[PDB]
PDB file of all heavy atoms in Angstrom:
ATOM      1  N   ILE O   1     105.300 118.262  74.428  1.00 31.68           N
ATOM      2  CA  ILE O   1     105.717 119.640  74.275  1.00 31.68           C
ATOM      3  C   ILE O   1     107.176 119.710  73.906  1.00 31.68           C
ATOM      4  O   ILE O   1     108.032 119.362  74.703  1.00 31.68           O
ATOM      5  CB  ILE O   1     105.515 120.452  75.554  1.00 31.68           C
ATOM      6  CG1 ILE O   1     104.046 120.441  75.958  1.00 31.68           C
ATOM      7  CG2 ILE O   1     106.026 121.875  75.371  1.00 31.68           C
ATOM      8  CD1 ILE O   1     103.854 120.185  77.401  1.00 31.68           C
ATOM      9  N   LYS O   2     107.455 120.191  72.704  1.00 32.44           N
ATOM     10  CA  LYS O   2     108.823 120.243  72.198  1.00 32.44           C
ATOM     11  C   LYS O   2     109.301 121.685  72.128  1.00 32.44           C
ATOM     12  O   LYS O   2     108.590 122.549  71.617  1.00 32.44           O
ATOM     13  CB  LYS O   2     108.894 119.572  70.819  1.00 32.44           C
ATOM     14  CG  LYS O   2     110.108 119.946  69.949  1.00 32.44           C
ATOM     15  CD  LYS O   2     111.210 118.911  70.031  1.00 32.44           C
ATOM     16  CE  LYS O   2     112.209 119.085  68.904  1.00 32.44           C
ATOM     17  NZ  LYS O   2     113.469 118.358  69.159  1.00 32.44           N
ATOM     18  N   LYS O   3     110.501 121.941  72.637  1.00 33.03           N
ATOM     19  CA  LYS O   3     111.056 123.286  72.674  1.00 33.03           C
ATOM     20  C   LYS O   3     111.943 123.586  71.467  1.00 33.03           C
ATOM     21  O   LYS O   3     112.841 122.821  71.137  1.00 33.03           O
ATOM     22  CB  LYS O   3     111.852 123.494  73.960  1.00 33.03           C
ATOM     23  CG  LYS O   3     112.534 124.848  74.062  1.00 33.03           C
ATOM     24  CD  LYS O   3     113.629 124.818  75.114  1.00 33.03           C
ATOM     25  CE  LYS O   3     114.475 126.086  75.096  1.00 33.03           C
ATOM     26  NZ  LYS O   3     115.449 126.074  76.224  1.00 33.03           N
ATOM     27  N   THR O   4     111.676 124.705  70.806  1.00 32.88           N
ATOM     28  CA  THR O   4     112.521 125.163  69.716  1.00 32.88           C
ATOM     29  C   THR O   4     113.206 126.426  70.197  1.00 32.88           C
ATOM     30  O   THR O   4     112.920 126.893  71.291  1.00 32.88           O
ATOM     31  CB  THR O   4     111.722 125.452  68.423  1.00 32.88           C
ATOM     32  OG1 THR O   4     110.949 126.645  68.585  1.00 32.88           O
ATOM     33  CG2 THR O   4     110.780 124.299  68.099  1.00 32.88           C
ATOM     34  N   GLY O   5     114.105 126.966  69.383  1.00 27.80           N
ATOM     35  CA  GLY O   5     114.863 128.157  69.724  1.00 27.80           C
ATOM     36  C   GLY O   5     114.039 129.312  70.276  1.00 27.80           C
ATOM     37  O   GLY O   5     114.502 130.037  71.154  1.00 27.80           O
ATOM     38  N   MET O   6     112.818 129.497  69.787  1.00 27.18           N
ATOM     39  CA  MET O   6     112.020 130.590  70.324  1.00 27.18           C
ATOM     40  C   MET O   6     110.560 130.237  70.496  1.00 27.18           C
ATOM     41  O   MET O   6     109.754 131.109  70.834  1.00 27.18           O
ATOM     42  CB  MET O   6     112.156 131.849  69.448  1.00 27.18           C
ATOM     43  CG  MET O   6     111.701 131.735  67.995  1.00 27.18           C
ATOM     44  SD  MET O   6     112.411 133.074  66.981  1.00 27.18           S
ATOM     45  CE  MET O   6     114.155 132.715  67.230  1.00 27.18           C
ATOM     46  N   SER O   7     110.205 128.966  70.296  1.00 27.37           N
ATOM     47  CA  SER O   7     108.818 128.565  70.545  1.00 27.37           C
ATOM     48  C   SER O   7     108.686 127.239  71.296  1.00 27.37           C
ATOM     49  O   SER O   7     109.673 126.565  71.595  1.00 27.37           O
ATOM     50  CB  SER O   7     108.046 128.462  69.238  1.00 27.37           C
ATOM     51  OG  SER O   7     108.225 127.168  68.686  1.00 27.37           O
ATOM     52  N   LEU O   8     107.443 126.893  71.599  1.00 26.84           N
ATOM     53  CA  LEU O   8     107.094 125.599  72.132  1.00 26.84           C
ATOM     54  C   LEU O   8     106.061 125.006  71.201  1.00 26.84           C
ATOM     55  O   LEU O   8     105.034 125.641  70.930  1.00 26.84           O
ATOM     56  CB  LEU O   8     106.516 125.682  73.549  1.00 26.84           C
ATOM     57  CG  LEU O   8     107.341 126.271  74.680  1.00 26.84           C
ATOM     58  CD1 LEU O   8     106.543 126.105  75.979  1.00 26.84           C
ATOM     59  CD2 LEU O   8     108.695 125.583  74.767  1.00 26.84           C
ATOM     60  N   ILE O   9     106.330 123.796  70.717  1.00 26.11           N
ATOM     61  CA  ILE O   9     105.341 123.050  69.935  1.00 26.11           C
ATOM     62  C   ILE O   9     104.577 122.096  70.842  1.00 26.11           C
ATOM     63  O   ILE O   9     105.191 121.239  71.509  1.00 26.11           O
ATOM     64  CB  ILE O   9     105.995 122.223  68.794  1.00 26.11           C
ATOM     65  CG1 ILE O   9     107.071 123.038  68.080  1.00 26.11           C
ATOM     66  CG2 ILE O   9     104.931 121.650  67.852  1.00 26.11           C
ATOM     67  CD1 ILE O   9     106.545 124.348  67.506  1.00 26.11           C
ATOM     68  N   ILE O  10     103.248 122.208  70.829  1.00 23.52           N
ATOM     69  CA  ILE O  10     102.393 121.446  71.728  1.00 23.52           C
ATOM     70  C   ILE O  10     101.364 120.585  71.006  1.00 23.52           C
ATOM     71  O   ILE O  10     100.561 121.086  70.232  1.00 23.52           O
ATOM     72  CB  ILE O  10     101.642 122.390  72.694  1.00 23.52           C
ATOM     73  CG1 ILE O  10     102.639 123.281  73.443  1.00 23.52           C
ATOM     74  CG2 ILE O  10     100.784 121.591  73.660  1.00 23.52           C
ATOM     75  CD1 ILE O  10     101.975 124.271  74.366  1.00 23.52           C
ATOM     76  N   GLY O  11     101.379 119.281  71.246  1.00 22.69           N
ATOM     77  CA  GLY O  11     100.362 118.425  70.653  1.00 22.69           C
ATOM     78  C   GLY O  11      99.634 117.630  71.724  1.00 22.69           C
ATOM     79  O   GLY O  11     100.260 117.109  72.651  1.00 22.69           O
ATOM     80  N   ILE O  12      98.315 117.547  71.599  1.00 26.05           N
ATOM     81  CA  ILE O  12      97.481 116.817  72.552  1.00 26.05           C
ATOM     82  C   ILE O  12      96.757 115.706  71.837  1.00 26.05           C
ATOM     83  O   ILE O  12      96.172 115.929  70.786  1.00 26.05           O
ATOM     84  CB  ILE O  12      96.450 117.729  73.237  1.00 26.05           C
ATOM     85  CG1 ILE O  12      97.168 118.818  74.021  1.00 26.05           C
ATOM     86  CG2 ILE O  12      95.554 116.904  74.172  1.00 26.05           C
ATOM     87  CD1 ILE O  12      96.241 119.867  74.615  1.00 26.05           C
ATOM     88  N   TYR O  13      96.813 114.494  72.386  1.00 21.87           N
ATOM     89  CA  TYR O  13      96.187 113.355  71.719  1.00 21.87           C
ATOM     90  C   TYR O  13      95.300 112.568  72.683  1.00 21.87           C
ATOM     91  O   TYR O  13      95.466 112.639  73.901  1.00 21.87           O
ATOM     92  CB  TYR O  13      97.250 112.415  71.126  1.00 21.87           C
ATOM     93  CG  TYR O  13      97.926 111.593  72.204  1.00 21.87           C
ATOM     94  CD1 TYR O  13      97.467 110.317  72.540  1.00 21.87           C
ATOM     95  CD2 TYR O  13      98.997 112.111  72.915  1.00 21.87           C
ATOM     96  CE1 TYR O  13      98.070 109.582  73.542  1.00 21.87           C
ATOM     97  CE2 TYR O  13      99.616 111.381  73.909  1.00 21.87           C
ATOM     98  CZ  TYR O  13      99.139 110.124  74.229  1.00 21.87           C
ATOM     99  OH  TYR O  13      99.752 109.411  75.229  1.00 21.87           O
ATOM    100  N   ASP O  14      94.366 111.813  72.120  1.00 21.34           N
ATOM    101  CA  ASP O  14      93.628 110.828  72.899  1.00 21.34           C
ATOM    102  C   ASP O  14      93.496 109.563  72.080  1.00 21.34           C
ATOM    103  O   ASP O  14      93.679 109.577  70.858  1.00 21.34           O
ATOM    104  CB  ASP O  14      92.243 111.332  73.309  1.00 21.34           C
ATOM    105  CG  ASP O  14      91.583 110.438  74.352  1.00 21.34           C
ATOM    106  OD1 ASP O  14      92.281 109.984  75.284  1.00 21.34           O
ATOM    107  OD2 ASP O  14      90.373 110.172  74.232  1.00 21.34           O
ATOM    108  N   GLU O  15      93.224 108.458  72.765  1.00 24.27           N
ATOM    109  CA  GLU O  15      92.991 107.173  72.118  1.00 24.27           C
ATOM    110  C   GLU O  15      91.938 107.348  71.016  1.00 24.27           C
ATOM    111  O   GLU O  15      91.010 108.133  71.175  1.00 24.27           O
ATOM    112  CB  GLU O  15      92.560 106.141  73.172  1.00 24.27           C
ATOM    113  CG  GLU O  15      91.652 105.021  72.701  1.00 24.27           C
ATOM    114  CD  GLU O  15      90.192 105.355  72.915  1.00 24.27           C
ATOM    115  OE1 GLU O  15      89.895 106.095  73.879  1.00 24.27           O
ATOM    116  OE2 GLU O  15      89.351 104.895  72.108  1.00 24.27           O
ATOM    117  N   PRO O  16      92.078 106.631  69.886  1.00 22.11           N
ATOM    118  CA  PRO O  16      93.072 105.597  69.580  1.00 22.11           C
ATOM    119  C   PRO O  16      94.425 106.113  69.075  1.00 22.11           C
ATOM    120  O   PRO O  16      95.149 105.339  68.434  1.00 22.11           O
ATOM    121  CB  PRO O  16      92.375 104.783  68.486  1.00 22.11           C
ATOM    122  CG  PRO O  16      91.582 105.796  67.746  1.00 22.11           C
ATOM    123  CD  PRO O  16      91.107 106.790  68.787  1.00 22.11           C
ATOM    124  N   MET O  17      94.765 107.379  69.336  1.00 22.00           N
ATOM    125  CA  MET O  17      96.096 107.860  68.971  1.00 22.00           C
ATOM    126  C   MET O  17      97.083 107.407  70.032  1.00 22.00           C
ATOM    127  O   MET O  17      96.770 107.394  71.230  1.00 22.00           O
ATOM    128  CB  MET O  17      96.149 109.387  68.812  1.00 22.00           C
ATOM    129  CG  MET O  17      97.379 109.868  68.030  1.00 22.00           C
ATOM    130  SD  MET O  17      97.232 111.538  67.356  1.00 22.00           S
ATOM    131  CE  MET O  17      98.795 111.726  66.510  1.00 22.00           C
ATOM    132  N   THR O  18      98.274 107.034  69.582  1.00 23.20           N
ATOM    133  CA  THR O  18      99.297 106.539  70.485  1.00 23.20           C
ATOM    134  C   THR O  18     100.240 107.667  70.900  1.00 23.20           C
ATOM    135  O   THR O  18     100.373 108.675  70.188  1.00 23.20           O
ATOM    136  CB  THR O  18     100.084 105.403  69.824  1.00 23.20           C
ATOM    137  OG1 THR O  18     100.857 105.935  68.742  1.00 23.20           O
ATOM    138  CG2 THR O  18      99.124 104.344  69.285  1.00 23.20           C
ATOM    139  N   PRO O  19     100.890 107.513  72.064  1.00 23.61           N
ATOM    140  CA  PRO O  19     101.906 108.498  72.437  1.00 23.61           C
ATOM    141  C   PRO O  19     103.006 108.587  71.382  1.00 23.61           C
ATOM    142  O   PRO O  19     103.476 109.686  71.095  1.00 23.61           O
ATOM    143  CB  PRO O  19     102.466 107.958  73.754  1.00 23.61           C
ATOM    144  CG  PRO O  19     101.440 107.035  74.266  1.00 23.61           C
ATOM    145  CD  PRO O  19     100.714 106.475  73.091  1.00 23.61           C
ATOM    146  N   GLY O  20     103.411 107.455  70.815  1.00 23.98           N
ATOM    147  CA  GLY O  20     104.444 107.464  69.789  1.00 23.98           C
ATOM    148  C   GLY O  20     104.074 108.325  68.583  1.00 23.98           C
ATOM    149  O   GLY O  20     104.907 109.061  68.042  1.00 23.98           O
ATOM    150  N   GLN O  21     102.817 108.238  68.163  1.00 26.92           N
ATOM    151  CA  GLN O  21     102.331 109.025  67.037  1.00 26.92           C
ATOM    152  C   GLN O  21     102.356 110.529  67.338  1.00 26.92           C
ATOM    153  O   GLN O  21     102.814 111.320  66.516  1.00 26.92           O
ATOM    154  CB  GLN O  21     100.926 108.568  66.646  1.00 26.92           C
ATOM    155  CG  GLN O  21     100.934 107.207  65.937  1.00 26.92           C
ATOM    156  CD  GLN O  21      99.590 106.487  65.959  1.00 26.92           C
ATOM    157  OE1 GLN O  21      98.681 106.832  66.727  1.00 26.92           O
ATOM    158  NE2 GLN O  21      99.469 105.457  65.120  1.00 26.92           N
ATOM    159  N   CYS O  22     101.879 110.910  68.520  1.00 24.30           N
ATOM    160  CA  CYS O  22     101.923 112.290  68.976  1.00 24.30           C
ATOM    161  C   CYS O  22     103.360 112.778  69.080  1.00 24.30           C
ATOM    162  O   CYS O  22     103.690 113.865  68.583  1.00 24.30           O
ATOM    163  CB  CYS O  22     101.221 112.422  70.327  1.00 24.30           C
ATOM    164  SG  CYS O  22     101.218 114.093  71.039  1.00 24.30           S
ATOM    165  N   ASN O  23     104.213 111.974  69.715  1.00 24.64           N
ATOM    166  CA  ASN O  23     105.641 112.296  69.807  1.00 24.64           C
ATOM    167  C   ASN O  23     106.210 112.568  68.437  1.00 24.64           C
ATOM    168  O   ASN O  23     106.863 113.581  68.209  1.00 24.64           O
ATOM    169  CB  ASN O  23     106.428 111.157  70.471  1.00 24.64           C
ATOM    170  CG  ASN O  23     106.096 111.010  71.943  1.00 24.64           C
ATOM    171  OD1 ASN O  23     105.586 111.947  72.552  1.00 24.64           O
ATOM    172  ND2 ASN O  23     106.372 109.834  72.520  1.00 24.64           N
ATOM    173  N   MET O  24     105.939 111.656  67.519  1.00 26.07           N
ATOM    174  CA  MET O  24     106.516 111.744  66.197  1.00 26.07           C
ATOM    175  C   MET O  24     106.126 113.040  65.488  1.00 26.07           C
ATOM    176  O   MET O  24     106.994 113.737  64.981  1.00 26.07           O
ATOM    177  CB  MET O  24     106.114 110.526  65.368  1.00 26.07           C
ATOM    178  CG  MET O  24     107.001 109.298  65.657  1.00 26.07           C
ATOM    179  SD  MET O  24     106.588 107.722  64.841  1.00 26.07           S
ATOM    180  CE  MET O  24     104.804 107.683  64.926  1.00 26.07           C
ATOM    181  N   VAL O  25     104.843 113.385  65.480  1.00 24.69           N
ATOM    182  CA  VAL O  25     104.347 114.571  64.782  1.00 24.69           C
ATOM    183  C   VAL O  25     104.902 115.863  65.365  1.00 24.69           C
ATOM    184  O   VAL O  25     105.344 116.758  64.653  1.00 24.69           O
ATOM    185  CB  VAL O  25     102.812 114.639  64.843  1.00 24.69           C
ATOM    186  CG1 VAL O  25     102.311 115.948  64.262  1.00 24.69           C
ATOM    187  CG2 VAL O  25     102.199 113.461  64.118  1.00 24.69           C
ATOM    188  N   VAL O  26     104.870 115.970  66.696  1.00 22.05           N
ATOM    189  CA  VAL O  26     105.282 117.201  67.367  1.00 22.05           C
ATOM    190  C   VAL O  26     106.787 117.409  67.284  1.00 22.05           C
ATOM    191  O   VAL O  26     107.280 118.501  66.970  1.00 22.05           O
ATOM    192  CB  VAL O  26     104.856 117.194  68.844  1.00 22.05           C
ATOM    193  CG1 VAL O  26     105.482 118.345  69.598  1.00 22.05           C
ATOM    194  CG2 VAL O  26     103.344 117.253  68.947  1.00 22.05           C
ATOM    195  N   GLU O  27     107.525 116.349  67.562  1.00 21.09           N
ATOM    196  CA  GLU O  27     108.964 116.444  67.599  1.00 21.09           C
ATOM    197  C   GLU O  27     109.566 116.612  66.210  1.00 21.09           C
ATOM    198  O   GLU O  27     110.560 117.327  66.054  1.00 21.09           O
ATOM    199  CB  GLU O  27     109.546 115.207  68.287  1.00 21.09           C
ATOM    200  CG  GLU O  27     109.050 115.070  69.708  1.00 21.09           C
ATOM    201  CD  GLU O  27     109.566 113.841  70.403  1.00 21.09           C
ATOM    202  OE1 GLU O  27     110.795 113.615  70.372  1.00 21.09           O
ATOM    203  OE2 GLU O  27     108.738 113.117  70.995  1.00 21.09           O
ATOM    204  N   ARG O  28     108.975 115.990  65.188  1.00 19.98           N
ATOM    205  CA  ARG O  28     109.592 116.106  63.865  1.00 19.98           C
ATOM    206  C   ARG O  28     109.402 117.548  63.335  1.00 19.98           C
ATOM    207  O   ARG O  28     110.306 118.107  62.709  1.00 19.98           O
ATOM    208  CB  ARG O  28     109.029 115.072  62.883  1.00 19.98           C
ATOM    209  CG  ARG O  28     107.608 115.416  62.433  1.00 19.98           C
ATOM    210  CD  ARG O  28     106.947 114.347  61.575  1.00 19.98           C
ATOM    211  NE  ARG O  28     105.619 114.772  61.120  1.00 19.98           N
ATOM    212  CZ  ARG O  28     104.701 113.936  60.648  1.00 19.98           C
ATOM    213  NH1 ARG O  28     104.969 112.638  60.591  1.00 19.98           N
ATOM    214  NH2 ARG O  28     103.517 114.395  60.249  1.00 19.98           N
ATOM    215  N   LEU O  29     108.246 118.159  63.598  1.00 16.75           N
ATOM    216  CA  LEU O  29     108.033 119.530  63.148  1.00 16.75           C
ATOM    217  C   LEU O  29     108.989 120.436  63.917  1.00 16.75           C
ATOM    218  O   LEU O  29     109.656 121.311  63.340  1.00 16.75           O
ATOM    219  CB  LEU O  29     106.591 119.967  63.349  1.00 16.75           C
ATOM    220  CG  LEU O  29     106.408 121.435  62.984  1.00 16.75           C
ATOM    221  CD1 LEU O  29     106.697 121.645  61.483  1.00 16.75           C
ATOM    222  CD2 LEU O  29     105.033 121.857  63.361  1.00 16.75           C
ATOM    223  N   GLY O  30     109.095 120.183  65.220  1.00 18.21           N
ATOM    224  CA  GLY O  30     110.068 120.882  66.040  1.00 18.21           C
ATOM    225  C   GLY O  30     111.467 120.898  65.451  1.00 18.21           C
ATOM    226  O   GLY O  30     112.103 121.960  65.376  1.00 18.21           O
ATOM    227  N   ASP O  31     111.952 119.736  65.024  1.00 18.78           N
ATOM    228  CA  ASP O  31     113.305 119.644  64.476  1.00 18.78           C
ATOM    229  C   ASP O  31     113.432 120.461  63.205  1.00 18.78           C
ATOM    230  O   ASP O  31     114.462 121.073  62.953  1.00 18.78           O
ATOM    231  CB  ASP O  31     113.695 118.184  64.186  1.00 18.78           C
ATOM    232  CG  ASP O  31     114.000 117.396  65.451  1.00 18.78           C
ATOM    233  OD1 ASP O  31     114.263 118.029  66.504  1.00 18.78           O
ATOM    234  OD2 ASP O  31     113.975 116.142  65.383  1.00 18.78           O
ATOM    235  N   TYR O  32     112.370 120.463  62.408  1.00 18.34           N
ATOM    236  CA  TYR O  32     112.354 121.210  61.154  1.00 18.34           C
ATOM    237  C   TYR O  32     112.377 122.713  61.443  1.00 18.34           C
ATOM    238  O   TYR O  32     113.147 123.473  60.838  1.00 18.34           O
ATOM    239  CB  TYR O  32     111.122 120.819  60.322  1.00 18.34           C
ATOM    240  CG  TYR O  32     111.012 121.537  58.983  1.00 18.34           C
ATOM    241  CD1 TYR O  32     112.132 121.754  58.194  1.00 18.34           C
ATOM    242  CD2 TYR O  32     109.781 121.956  58.504  1.00 18.34           C
ATOM    243  CE1 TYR O  32     112.027 122.384  56.961  1.00 18.34           C
ATOM    244  CE2 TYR O  32     109.668 122.592  57.288  1.00 18.34           C
ATOM    245  CZ  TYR O  32     110.791 122.807  56.526  1.00 18.34           C
ATOM    246  OH  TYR O  32     110.667 123.460  55.338  1.00 18.34           O
ATOM    247  N   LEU O  33     111.554 123.136  62.398  1.00 15.79           N
ATOM    248  CA  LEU O  33     111.515 124.541  62.798  1.00 15.79           C
ATOM    249  C   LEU O  33     112.849 124.979  63.402  1.00 15.79           C
ATOM    250  O   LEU O  33     113.334 126.064  63.137  1.00 15.79           O
ATOM    251  CB  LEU O  33     110.362 124.772  63.768  1.00 15.79           C
ATOM    252  CG  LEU O  33     108.978 124.664  63.124  1.00 15.79           C
ATOM    253  CD1 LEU O  33     107.836 124.863  64.134  1.00 15.79           C
ATOM    254  CD2 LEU O  33     108.859 125.665  62.000  1.00 15.79           C
ATOM    255  N   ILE O  34     113.473 124.115  64.185  1.00 14.98           N
ATOM    256  CA  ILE O  34     114.769 124.446  64.769  1.00 14.98           C
ATOM    257  C   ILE O  34     115.794 124.709  63.675  1.00 14.98           C
ATOM    258  O   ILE O  34     116.511 125.711  63.714  1.00 14.98           O
ATOM    259  CB  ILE O  34     115.254 123.324  65.696  1.00 14.98           C
ATOM    260  CG1 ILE O  34     114.500 123.413  67.027  1.00 14.98           C
ATOM    261  CG2 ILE O  34     116.760 123.386  65.898  1.00 14.98           C
ATOM    262  CD1 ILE O  34     114.668 122.214  67.899  1.00 14.98           C
ATOM    263  N   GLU O  35     115.832 123.831  62.676  1.00 13.06           N
ATOM    264  CA  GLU O  35     116.764 123.983  61.563  1.00 13.06           C
ATOM    265  C   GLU O  35     116.509 125.275  60.804  1.00 13.06           C
ATOM    266  O   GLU O  35     117.419 125.813  60.191  1.00 13.06           O
ATOM    267  CB  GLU O  35     116.678 122.788  60.602  1.00 13.06           C
ATOM    268  CG  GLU O  35     117.263 121.507  61.174  1.00 13.06           C
ATOM    269  CD  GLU O  35     118.735 121.656  61.552  1.00 13.06           C
ATOM    270  OE1 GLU O  35     119.549 121.995  60.660  1.00 13.06           O
ATOM    271  OE2 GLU O  35     119.078 121.433  62.737  1.00 13.06           O
TER     272      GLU O  35
END
């Protein structure tokens, strides 16, 4: 769950998806939305 200026971006994953992959997708969109 990544926090932006006025929203929360939430991604849910299960195997064979890795935490790193979920982190990457959610957080990178977050950074883009923040900008």
Side-chain angles (χ1 to χ4, degrees):
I1 301 135
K2 160 98 164 164
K3 177 198 171 175
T4 72
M6 61 199 60
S7 87
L8 300 185
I9 317 303
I10 305 178
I12 299 174
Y13 75 94
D14 192 41
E15 151 266 330
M17 198 161 181
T18 68
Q21 287 160 345
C22 179
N23 291 340
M24 278 176 320
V25 173
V26 170
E27 300 178 50
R28 73 186 183 197
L29 175 64
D31 286 341
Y32 180 41
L33 290 178
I34 283 168
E35 289 301 302

